[model samples]
Target: ATIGRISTGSKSLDKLLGGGIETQAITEVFGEFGSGKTQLAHTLAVMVQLPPEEGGLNGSVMWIDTENTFRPERIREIAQNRGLDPDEVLKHIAYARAFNSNHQMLLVQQAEDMIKELLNTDRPVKLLIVDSLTSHFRSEYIGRGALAERQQKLAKHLADLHRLANLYDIAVFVTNQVQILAHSATLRVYLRKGKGGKRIARLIDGEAVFSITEKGIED
Candidate 1:
């Protein structure tokens, strides 16, 4: 039998992902503003505390906040509504705030260190959520002439996360923003542009289409 990787949370979303957030893999989700990216991340923060057999990860979550979207109150509400122990569910999530490009990279690296530390003690991390990957890339560099360099850097950053996922047996969900391809047909041209590169469609493993209803995520 072939071994498959799935993230350890959200059975419904995991079903959409064909099981779990493929363990040791990157499941990139890209969409326009109001497209439910952050809502999914928030939902997963609560979901990761669920056990793997229940279609949940039963593992802790590490959230690297790039756009300042981590909300404890919302997570508490989700947990409460889901019939989970809000305090216990909240305890499994670890939050890190990254202020700038360098800060973002450092914080991400720190998250990896924390994961390693957890593993050393017999505990393991099951999921990682980066609220938005494109913001740092777009904010750090600029201009058409710099695109090549940006793509290279973005690729390397992604490669690092890929390595971490494989080495640690964890799932990484990166939220991406869609770019309007001004020259192409609007319906067919949503693109995710990263630093030093544009992400190819095939490279993104799984995706969920969503909207926010009543200030919460609705699929």
Candidate 2:
């Protein structure tokens, strides 16, 4: 009698995630560039739409692109790799490009609007991805002089994500540039580059090794 989960497309990654990314909670992935942060996010976007038997929730994706990293071609490649129609997969995903920190936070409200609109629709958005969630926060608020203000703003932002997760019963997955406050993340995954050009995602309880290829993240 377990609640449903959203798969990450990679079997090993999902196993490290305790079956899959949990719903009604936030999952944060932090790592440096080339550590496969965005790669995992992209994989989840496609996997969330797969059939339940195939480890998906049969749902849609809400992608908040703050760093211009949301690529249609990547999604298409993932969808095709998973034996799904590329066009249909792209159609189910809703993309939002946030230009700045203020606009990025503002888009959260806009997400609520879209969530409300699609709550009862056939394709409900089950996954919310914020690729590099801390980029804008870090760049906009610099130095220890602004540390308190930055954390305050970040706290409120996390609260919004928490409330949204509980209220909508959807999975909120956010990526970070480095280790920050844990906030309300149910699962904190630390990803890094491993030996022989491998990507490693270290969870609180365990770890998973993977690689980024044409199909997406591979075990």
Candidate 3:
């Protein structure tokens, strides 16, 4: 089956991404502090709302915020730059703040329910953003004694995301601070800051350099 694409809002980055972020699969970006990963999520929140002609799915967003990075103001800025109504765009985005590992896992279940409910609506759910997907896991499970346990739990969480993506054809974008092997992810990006606040994104074999701005992702 052919996987679809959703723009990251940078034409150069999209070209490196084979058009844009692939749907029906998990796309992960890992980085350290100040790497622009969270900023990328915010830009995607607005990008997912644009029409297909503009590289969007014309769908709503479900952002599972893990680090309290979900901001209405950023969405407004991006929407305005894209020439869209800020209020209308914000209304379509559903935000959930997860407090812990268990709480985060339950969110996948809730996301499934929300997806079904919005499936027949004018603006169906198309994007699922798990900002900092591993933070809760990283903190809750520590040391060599708990490593295996954390992996198992994290794997199940990803399994649920994989199931949802395959069934609904929604795009899953997850940001991570550290990494473990996740064969479930179709596109894995490593983001790092370069000189003067620039960001470089490396795929398996390609690279795309972009800058984070108040407007959004830029080449």
Candidate 4:
């Protein structure tokens, strides 16, 4: 049932992800601050842009930055580490910044148009990254009084995300902050800080130990 896969450029980490990130899957990566949440997004954006023979989909990336975490320099640095032209690499990655929770939902709604435009091109959009998916929702909806309404709204957003994944067969990667995310992730990764310079990716029932370089995560 899986149509394709996206690699993280790390052999061990890719193995931990069960042969890389599969298409039509929402892979959620979450952790505390500075645990490589946005770093992973930058790394994957470059990976998605690489040629298929080199663990890529020969495609482009769509990134929805909610907390202003999308950095072009990071992508350029990572891409150049792999000998890719930085300017060309940056060109293919589409970016958006959502000011509020409702804006975030609408951004995802409008992403389909871009995907549709690139669907038949040589570099069809292969990856969608929503960095810190829960931040705006958590920020806007506060207190116990709003929990019920927040949950329903969040549920609808999740449904829309799931629809995007299924209909376009595009791989989705979202970073999160907390609960109410029991079913969206096909690949759920919990990143944790490690001693010295390691970043541990904890799976549901297994753990993958890797480290981040200026390039990206590696064994």
* TM-scores, each model vs. reference: 0.77, 0.93, 0.95, 0.94
Displacement of residue 84 (Cα, Å) in model 4 is 1.0
| Regions of candidate 1 where Cα sits further than 4 Å from its true position | 1-13, 120-123, 180-219
* Model 3: pairs clashing at backbone N, Cα or C within 3 Å: none
Residues 153-214, candidate 1: write the lDDT tens digits. 66767677777777887778787777411111101112232333222122221433333333
Residues 1-219, candidate 2: write the lDDT tens digits. 244698776678889888889878889998787778898899889888888888788888888998898899999999898798999999999999989888888888789988888888877778899886789988999977788888888888888888888888789999988633435577789899999878888885367888787777777
Q: How many steric clashes between backbone atoms does each model show?
A: 14, 0, 0, 0
lDDT of 3 by residue, 110-219 (tens): 99999999998888889999997999998999987787898899889999998888898899999988523544577788898888778998885367888888668988
Give the range where candidate 1 is weakest over 10 consecutive residues by summed lDDT: 180-189
Please identify which of the two predictions, 3 or 4, would achieve the higher lDDT against the true structure. Answer: 3
Across residues 1-219, which tens digit of lDDT does each residue of candidate 4 receive?
457888887777788888788779888888888888888888888988878788888988889999988889988899999889999999999999989999999999999999999999999888998987889988888987778777888888878888888888889999986424344567788888888788888786367777888887777
State in Å the error of residue 34, model 2: 0.8
TM-score-based ranking: 3, 4, 2, 1
> What lDDT does each candidate get?
0.63, 0.84, 0.87, 0.85
Residue 40 in model 3: lDDT: 92
**Model 1 whole-model lDDT (C-alpha atoms):** 0.63
- Between candidates 1 and 2, the one scoring higher on TM-score is 2
RMSD in angstroms, all models?
7.4, 1.9, 1.6, 1.7
